[PDB]
Design a protein around this ligand. Structure first.
Ligand SMILES: Cc1ncccc1N[C@H]1CCCS(=O)(=O)C1
Length: 103
């Protein structure tokens, strides 16, 4: 429980982060050409929010996996110096930092 309440703390802080705008909603393949083909397991903050609310996270490491999946998909699809890419690095570094503020 104390495990998964810090996940809420992290997810809340990630949802309201300045650089969270690319990862708030699922990627729209109708708008992002090639995303369907390149990324096989899309993930975003709202999907993590849906699952966490509904309790679908057995442990905190299942929560961290979905978080790292957001940024792996980001680095896979976006160049590091792209706008989404630059935001993904800010978000990936923020997550890992806050995550070790706990573990
Ligand atoms: C997270 C991400 N990964 C790859 C490409 C783009 C994005 N950003 C989103 C910006 C809002 C709408 S969107 O659906 O175009 C996609």
């Amino acid at each position: 429980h104390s495990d998964l309440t810090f996940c809420e703390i992290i997810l809340m802080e990630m949802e309201s982060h300045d650089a969270a705008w690319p990862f708030l909603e699922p990627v729209n393949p109708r708008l992002v050409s090639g995303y369907r083909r390149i990324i096989k397991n899309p993930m975003d903050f709202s999907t993590m929010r849906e699952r966490l609310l509904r309790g679908g996270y057995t442990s905190s490491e299942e929560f961290a996996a979905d978080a790292l999946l957001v940024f792996d998909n980001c680095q896979t699809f976006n160049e590091d110096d792209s706008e989404v890419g630059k935001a993904g690095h800010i978000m990936r570094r923020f997550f890992e930092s806050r995550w070790e503020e706990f573990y």
